[PDB]
Amino acid sequence: PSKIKIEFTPEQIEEFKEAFTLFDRTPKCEMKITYGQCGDVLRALGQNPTQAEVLRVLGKPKQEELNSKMMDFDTFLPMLQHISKNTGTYEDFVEGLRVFDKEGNGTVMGAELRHVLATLGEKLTEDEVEKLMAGQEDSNGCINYEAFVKHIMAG
Amino acid sequence: DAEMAAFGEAAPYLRKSEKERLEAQTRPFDLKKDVFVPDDKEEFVKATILSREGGKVTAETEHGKTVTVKEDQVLQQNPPKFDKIEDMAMLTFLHEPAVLYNLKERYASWMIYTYSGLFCVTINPYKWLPVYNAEVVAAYRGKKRSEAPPHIFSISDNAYQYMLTDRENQSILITGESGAGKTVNTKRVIQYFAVIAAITLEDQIIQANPALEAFGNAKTVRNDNSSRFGKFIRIHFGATGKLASADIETYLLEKSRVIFQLKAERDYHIFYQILSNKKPELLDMLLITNNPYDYAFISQGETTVASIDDAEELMATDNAFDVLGFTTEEKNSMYKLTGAIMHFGNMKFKLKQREEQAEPDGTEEADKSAYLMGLNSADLLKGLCHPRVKVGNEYVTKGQNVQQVVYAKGALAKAVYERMFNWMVTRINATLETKQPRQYFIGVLDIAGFEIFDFNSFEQLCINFTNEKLQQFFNHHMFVLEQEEYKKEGIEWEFIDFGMDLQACIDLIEKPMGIMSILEEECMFPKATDMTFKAKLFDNHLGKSSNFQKPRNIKGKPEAHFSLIHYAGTVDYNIIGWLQKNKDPLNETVVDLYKKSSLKMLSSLFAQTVSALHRENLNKLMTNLRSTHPHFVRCIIPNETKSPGVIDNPLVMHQLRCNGVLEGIRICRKGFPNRILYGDFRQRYRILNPAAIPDSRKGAEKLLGSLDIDHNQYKFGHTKVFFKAGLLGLLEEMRDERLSRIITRIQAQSRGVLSRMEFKKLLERRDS
Ligand SMILES: COC(=O)N1CCN(Cc2cccc(NC(=O)Nc3ccc(C)nc3)c2F)CC1
Ligand SMILES: Nc1ncnc2c1ncn2[C@@H]1O[C@H](COP(=O)(O)OP(=O)(O)O)[C@@H](O)[C@H]1O
Ligand code: VO4
Ligand SMILES: [Mg+2]
């Protein structure tokens, strides 16, 4: 927290200060975020940390702290700097999805990839999977996993 | 224990608790003291060394006995971390008592399956265990060998994974003596694929066995539910692994059982199932009483079995036929022919006054037989007493005495029964064939097992010869083809002689001038007798073939003519009637009446030698098996009294020795039992380090070389990468671990996209 030297230009800080303000859901409009929405703001600002990496920079909080512990921008900024230091290649991603390619034809069954993202690793909700998978399946309900990897990496 | 939660109530019968694991691990043990010593009655016993003196050890046995033995007779006990080990290929000290005691200790905890290298050992519990339910089936699905406890379901799942990974047909070869557990494990393999596919072909494959067992199984002195036929069940799969179809090939049903029984045995189950009076309409339809002792063909031995509810079993048989889609007409025709067989054996005959010619002695039982068979009883009786011969537009009759008619009557009943059983198998296959596309199959072999009775005849030779060939198939796969694979591939390897080869015994039985070939030649000589056959066997083999010996005749035991040193033991064979059994002749006048029957089933059933046909079935089966990757299940009989949880050390030791279990574990440990083509290696393991593969062989070298592994545990062949089973298990764990981390990273990028999608909506309202 204190050891973190802030490297960002003052213009970047002001750009991040506004993105952080857009996430304000406080009743008094105090421009603060709950510990639970930190992941979202790091992600809105171009980062892709795991749920575990977010929890580590938050100092391993309880679910109660994620729901109702407030954070100001001054506390958020060193967390953004630390997360930006630390991801997996396109090749790793394609090889991971190839495991589910039964035939080796370049596609994976839509319902199978949806099931994998909602059961394995740091599970995504059925809602998160629905939103992410929207309009990605072909006429046969299949997914071109290397086109999908390019889609999420450009997102 | 939480990792075992998916298995439910089966969990303590499959894997020991973490609490037991900690108890074993910390139990008292001294590597120097805790040993095994030979024992004249118990094979080997656990002992603690008391004194070491001039090349000999003085130890105290587990039975409180001081024994003095040579240092080279003493074998080391494996430390407690190895107690009840799941795979015996992992033991530090591999020897006979280590294997025996590991099996005994698992069996004492009701853990009846143990891996032994790439094969599996199973010991008959003689008790129902809650390890075969749909919850256990679901729990085994897709599990690696390390993550799941040993079970018949995991052997089945492993075979399925090998099928899809290697793109080759698989076989599950289940060995054992009579009553060891082959039929139970065969039905469990079928259950596994049927239940997985269910999560009516699936119902039909499960119901095929009760229908077959009613007609093809019987109580023998060794097994209350003994299989009297062999079978190969193929479960067909589509290219992506979906269940497609199934088929059943059956081999050589024991025909004599239909009309003959030894003292301590029954005829086929069906007769007793019908006579149970569970469906009283069957007794009225078949024109029979409820007394088996009223029917000559079925009551020569036993009629009841303590462990079998014949009333309950007839309902299982009748329901199996319904599920299988057999019509009422098809079901009733099978019952009617069974009843007709019962009546047929009760037809009595007498000699005419002035000639050695048979004539009916009453006609009541012939009338009932003909009625059920859709024949005229006068035609039946005339055909049996005066079989027709064609001589230029006349059917002259051949004379027959009572011995000839009785024999002919028996041959005909045996033929009707065998053809009916074969009709039923063809009819089961008609429903099991779905016309659904397939690419692969997993075949399950269930033969009639090694048996020794007080009286061993032609049927015991054919059975025991099948077991000999199957043991030799294991020997060949494990010790011959395996070492050949290493050499062809260019893997540094010194040939090991495992002393597992049954060629001399197999040659004695099937090669020219052997037992079967001599019998077949004697069948072609019209004047040959059982004693010209017996003389020919002795002249060609006594003092010439190591496995052919004199009989070991004992007073209060039936007489034998020779003894054969089989893999599983020395068997004394009685040679009477072997020529007749081999030729299997039939009265062709009565066969013509069967062809003209008003009962459509009997009409269709009838629309050179047994040894020749057996030899042809065997070697055609052995070539189907050669084009599959075999998986062996070695079923073991624990004791001679059907006592649950009781182990007889010499009996278990004998079975492990003649099965070649230790030699089999050794080749798995010393060799490289897992292998993969270079192209296939790249597809499966590039995920471990994609940077190492940015030539398929060079790529495999670079990738394996970049890993923190024992680099001695893999070898490069001309076309494949070879692995020790332990290294493969580690690579699979590493692959699963890396896949989990990649999915986590894909999910993090996915959360990034979703948050950025929402951020773009927020910006569009104010800033964009
Ligand atoms: C240890 O865990 C397991 O039991 N499994 C893990 C996943 N495995 C898949 C898999 C990987 C690597 C190689 C092969 N194939 C192979 O060894 N083929 C082979 C070996 C010997 C013979 C006589 N014939 C063909 C393969 F299937 C198989 C299950
Ligand atoms: N795994 C098992 N669980 C429970 N009982 C078993 C098991 N294996 C064998 N048995 C018992 O032993 C009998 C003989 O087994 P079976 O499979 O018919 O032998 P075989 O090897 O002759 O085909 C069974 O009917 C059953 O009573
Ligand atoms: O008793 V068995 O099924 O081996 O014949
Ligand atoms: Mg059987």
- 3-class SS letters over B125-184: CCCCCCCCCHHHHHHHCCCCCCCCCCCHHHHHHHHHHHHHHHCCCEEEEEECECCCCHHH
Which tokens belong to A101? 């390619």
Q: Which residues of B touch A133 (CB under 8 A)?
A: none
Rounded Cα distance between B289 and B283, Å, is 7
Nearest to A87 by CA among B738, B689, B745: B745
Where do the H-state alpha helices sit in B310-373?
A: 310-323, 328-344, 364-373
Contact B516, B611 (CB under 8 A): yes
3-state secondary structure string, A30-88?
CCCEEHHHHHHHHHHCCCCCCHHHHHHHCCCCCHHHHHHCEECHHHHHHHHHHHCCCCC
Close Cβ partners of B561 (under 8 Å, ≥ 6 residues apart): B534, B537, B551, B573, B574, B575
Q: How many CB atoms lie within 10 A of CB B8?
A: 13
Of B687, B754, B759, the CB nearest to A128: B754
Of A46, A98, A117, the CB nearest to B750: A117
- Residue B388 pairs in a beta bridge with B397
Alpha carbon nearest to ligand 1 atom 1, residue: B729
* Catalytic residue (choose from B102, B117, B171, B179): B179
Q: State the angle between helix axes of B649-659 and B458-475 in degrees (0 to 180), rounded to the nearest 10.
A: 70
Whether A77 and A4 map to the same domain: the answer is yes
Nearest to B227 by CA among B174, B273, B278: B174
Q: Which residues of B touch A122 (CB under 8 A)?
A: 744, 747-748
Return the residue matching tokens 């055609």: B620
Helix (H, G, I), strand (E, B) or coil at B674: strand
Signed CA dihedral, A99, B243, B13, B109: sign only: negative
Residue of B nearest to A155 (CA): B753
Rounded Cα distance between B157 and B150, Å, is 11
Rounded Cα distance between B473 and B177, Å, is 16
Active site residue B179: yes
Contact B74, B93 (CB under 8 A): no
Contact B126, B644 (CB under 8 A): yes
Helix (H, G, I), strand (E, B) or coil at B233: strand
- Does ligand 1 have an atom closer than 6 angstroms to the CB of B728? yes
Active site residue B178: yes
Greatest Cα-to-Cα distance within chain A, rounded to the nearest angstrom: 57
Whether A90 and A29 map to the same domain: the answer is no
Sheet (strand B674-677) strand order:
B674-677, B720-723, B714-716
Nearest to B179 by CA among B218, B128, B137: B218
- Does ligand 3 have an atom closer than 6 angstroms to the CB of B122? no
Is B230 known as a binding-site position? Answer: no
Rounded Cα distance between B694 and B691, Å, is 5
Nearest to B150 by CA among B218, B233, B87: B87
Alpha carbon nearest to ligand 3 atom 5, residue: B448
Return the residue matching tokens 């967390």: A79
Rounded Cα distance between A41 and A21, Å, is 10
From the candidates A45, A127, A132, A142, which should be mutated to test the interface with B, based on the most B CB atoms within 10 A?
Answer: A132
Interface contact B619, partner A, CB < 8 A: no
Contact A18, B767 (CB under 8 A): yes
Which tokens belong to B526? 């019209």
Rounded Cα distance between B456 and B451, Å, is 9
Is B577 known as a binding-site position? Answer: no
Give the end-to-end CA distance of chain B in Å, rounded to a whole number. 55
- Our CA-based measurement puts residue A117 at a distance from the nearest CA of chain B, in whole angstroms, of 7
Of A44, A53, A96, the CB nearest to B742: A96
CA distances from B494 to B89, B292, B486 (A): 20, 63, 10
- Torsion over CA of B648, B651, B657 and B661, rounded to 10 degrees? -60
Contact B34, B46 (CB under 8 A): yes
Q: Which residues of A touch B739 (CB under 8 A)?
A: 96, 99, 120
- Residue B259, exposed/middle/buried by CB under 10 A (0-12, 13-18, 19+)? buried
Rounded Cα distance between B351 and B361, Å, is 9
Q: Which residues of B touch A124 (CB under 8 A)?
A: 747, 750-751
Rounded Cα distance between B676 and B310, Å, is 51
From the candidates A99, A108, A149, which should be mutated to test the interface with B, based on the most B CB atoms within 10 A?
Answer: A99
Whether A102 and A60 map to the same domain: the answer is no
Whether A9 and A78 map to the same domain: the answer is yes
Between the CA of B226 and the centroid of ligand 2 the distance, in Å, is 9
Phi, psi torsion values for B277, nearest 5 degrees: 75, 20
Whether A135 and A103 map to the same domain: the answer is yes
- Torsion over CA of B201, B206, B208 and B210, rounded to 10 degrees? -150
Alpha carbon nearest to ligand 1 atom 24, residue: B629
Give the end-to-end CA distance of chain A in Å, rounded to a whole number. 29
Q: State the angle between helix axes of B678-685 and B725-766 in degrees (0 to 180), rounded to the nearest 10.
A: 40
Where do the H-state alpha helices sit in B51-151?
A: 96-107, 134-140
- Our CA-based measurement puts residue A49 at a distance from the nearest CA of chain B, in whole angstroms, of 6
Looking from the CA of residue B448, the nearest atom of ligand 3 is 5
Close Cβ partners of B551 (under 8 Å, ≥ 6 residues apart): B559, B560, B561, B562, B563, B572, B573
Q: What is the DSSP letter of A102?
A: S
- Residue B250 pairs in a beta bridge with B231
Note the residue count of chain B. Answer: 768
Of B749, B763, B766, the CB nearest to A48: B749
- Does ligand 2 have an atom closer than 6 angstroms to the CB of B230? no
Interface contact B679, partner A, CB < 8 A: no
Close Cβ partners of B761 (under 8 Å, ≥ 6 residues apart): none
Nearest to B246 by CA among B496, B499, B17, B430: B430
Mutate to test the pocket of ligand 3, among B183, B252, B636 (most ligand atoms within 8 A of CB): B183
Rounded Cα distance between A155 and B748, Å, is 12
Amino acid at position B58, single letter: T
Q: Is B659 left (phi over 0), alpha (psi -120 to 50) or beta?
A: alpha
Which tokens belong to B568? 């599983």
Whether A71 and A95 map to the same domain: the answer is no
> How many degrees, rounded to 5, is the angle at CA B443 between CA B441 and CA B448?
165
Alpha carbon nearest to ligand 2 atom 8, residue: B181
Q: How many CB atoms lie within 10 A of CB B134?
A: 12
Nearest to B212 by CA among B133, B148, B259, B270: B270
Residue-range domain boundaries for chain B = 684-766
Please state the domain count of chain A. 2
Label residues B612-643 b or e (16+ Cβ within 10 Å = b): eebbebbeebeebbeebebbbbbbbbbeeeee
Last residue of a domain, one of A85, A112, A142: A85
> How many degrees, rounded to 5, is the angle at CA B706 between CA B89 and CA B167?
55
- Torsion over CA of B276, B280, B286 and B289, rounded to 10 degrees? 60
Residue of A nearest to B759 (CA): A44
Is B181 known as a binding-site position? Answer: yes
Q: State the angle between helix axes of B696-705 and B678-685 in degrees (0 to 180), rounded to the nearest 10.
A: 50
Rounded Cα distance between B68 and B46, Å, is 14
* Catalytic residue (choose from B116, B156, B209, B227): B227
- Does ligand 1 have an atom closer than 6 angstroms to the CB of B628? no
Between the CA of B590 and the centroid of ligand 2 the distance, in Å, is 40
Is B443 known as a binding-site position? Answer: no
Whether A62 and A14 map to the same domain: the answer is yes
Active site residue B750: no
CATH class of the domain at B684-766: mainly alpha
Q: How many CB atoms lie within 10 A of CB B117?
A: 21
Return the residue matching tokens 């055909």: B383
Contact B48, B33 (CB under 8 A): yes
Which tokens belong to B629? 């990757």
Is B154 known as a binding-site position? Answer: no
- Does ligand 1 have an atom closer than 6 angstroms to the CB of B675? yes
Mutate to test the pocket of ligand 2, among B112, B113, B124, B183 (most ligand atoms within 8 A of CB): B124
Contact B228, B256 (CB under 8 A): no
Which tokens belong to B249? 């090939």
Domain range for residue A62?
Answer: 1-85
Rounded Cα distance between B180 and B619, Å, is 25
Nearest to B515 by CA among B472, B543, B545: B545
Q: How many CB atoms lie within 10 A of CB B74?
A: 17
| E strands in B370-429 | 388-390, 395-397
- Our CA-based measurement puts residue B247 at a distance from the nearest CA of chain A, in whole angstroms, of 26
Close Cβ partners of B358 (under 8 Å, ≥ 6 residues apart): B349, B350, B351, B352, B384, B385, B400, B401, B402, B404, B405
Contact B136, B151 (CB under 8 A): yes
Last residue of a domain, one of A53, A68, A85: A85
> How many degrees, rounded to 5, is the angle at CA B431 between CA B428 and CA B435?
130
Which tokens belong to B380? 């039946």
For B483, how many CA atoms within 13 A lie in the half-sphere containing its CB? 15
- The approach used to solve this structure was X-ray
Mutate to test the pocket of ligand 2, among B173, B184, B225 (most ligand atoms within 8 A of CB): B184
Label residues B733-757 b or e (16+ Cβ within 10 Å = b): ebbeebbeebbbbbbbbbbbbbbbe
Rounded Cα distance between B718 and B485, Å, is 11
Size of interface A-B (CB pairs under 8 A): 113
Close Cβ partners of B448 (under 8 Å, ≥ 6 residues apart): B178, B226, B227, B228, B229, B230, B254, B463, B466
Nearest to A22 by CA among B647, B438, B621, B764: B764
- Does ligand 2 have an atom closer than 6 angstroms to the CB of B217? no
Contact B456, B574 (CB under 8 A): yes
Q: Do A44 and B766 touch (CB under 8 A)?
A: no
Contact B188, B129 (CB under 8 A): no
Of A22, A121, A132, the CB nearest to B753: A132
Task: Say which CATH number the domain at A70 has.
Answer: 1.10.238.10
Mutate to test the pocket of ligand 3, among B226, B305, B633 (most ligand atoms within 8 A of CB): B226
Residue of A nearest to B240 (CA): A102
Q: What is the DSSP letter of B298?
A: T
Nearest to B475 by CA among B667, B653, B627: B667
Active site residue B301: no
Rounded Cα distance between B218 and B264, Å, is 11
- Residue B571, exposed/middle/buried by CB under 10 A (0-12, 13-18, 19+)? buried
* Catalytic residue (choose from B178, B217, B467, B589): B178
Nearest to B441 by CA among B236, B656, B645: B236
Interface contact B164, partner A, CB < 8 A: yes
Of A50, A99, A128, the CB nearest to B687: A99
Whether A95 and A67 map to the same domain: the answer is no
Rounded Cα distance between B35 and B74, Å, is 7
CA distances from B540 to B457, B512, B552, B604 (A): 20, 11, 19, 44
What are the percentages of helix, strand and coil residues in chain A, rounded to 5?
55, 5, 40
Helix (H, G, I), strand (E, B) or coil at B50: strand
Q: Report, in angstroms and rounded to the nearest whole number, the Rg of chain B calculated over CA atoms.
A: 31
Q: Do A132 and B687 touch (CB under 8 A)?
A: no
Give the closest ligand to the alpha carbon of residue B226.
Answer: 3
- Looking only at the bridges linking them, the beta strands covering B75-76 and B440-446 are unpaired
Phi, psi torsion values for B557, nearest 5 degrees: -120, 145
- Our CA-based measurement puts residue A1 at a distance from the nearest CA of chain B, in whole angstroms, of 23
Whether A76 and A110 map to the same domain: the answer is no
CA distances from B249 to B159, B235, B591 (A): 20, 12, 26
Helix (H, G, I), strand (E, B) or coil at B88: helix
Residues 233-252 of B with CB under 8 A from A: 239-241
